[PDB]
Design a protein around this ligand. Structure first.
Ligand code: NA
Length: 123
């Protein structure tokens, strides 16, 4: 899988694909990469764009946890992979609490960040 530098380059190309579709600022995007979650509907739907581009969603607008675990095995530095997979497992009940798919991705992502802020990154 990727080195940290390779992961950052890939997440920067995911940001540049999804950010232009949403009314989100550098402060909101840079803070989100840093684990700080602005309550902004455009930023919530940006997380859904990223989740889709990252291969983590199904066509019903839910997170596919099995596919997400497989992407983490493929894409993450080994140092981050096992912690990110344990976080996804711990956070699997979050999306069922929200009808709206941007809420599902945003709050699932926030759960991942809260699980371990030191390993969390977001595109
Ligand atoms: Na863990």
């Amino acid at each position: 899988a990727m080195t940290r530098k390779q992961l950052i380059n890939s997440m920067d190309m995911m940001r540049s694909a999804c950010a232009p579709k949403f009314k989100v600022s550098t402060e909101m995007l840079d803070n989100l990469r840093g684990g700080i979650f602005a309550e902004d509907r455009e930023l919530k739907c940006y997380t859904m764009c990223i989740a889709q581009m990252a291969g983590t969603m199904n066509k019903k607008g839910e997170i596919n946890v099995q596919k997400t675990l497989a992407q983490m095995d493929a894409m993450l530095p080994p140092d981050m992979r096992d912690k990110a997979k344990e976080a996804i497992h711990s956070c699997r009940d979050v999306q069922g609490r929200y009808k709206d798919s941007c809420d599902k991705t945003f709050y699932s992502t926030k759960c991942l960040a809260e699980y371990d802020r030191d390993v969390f990154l977001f595109p």
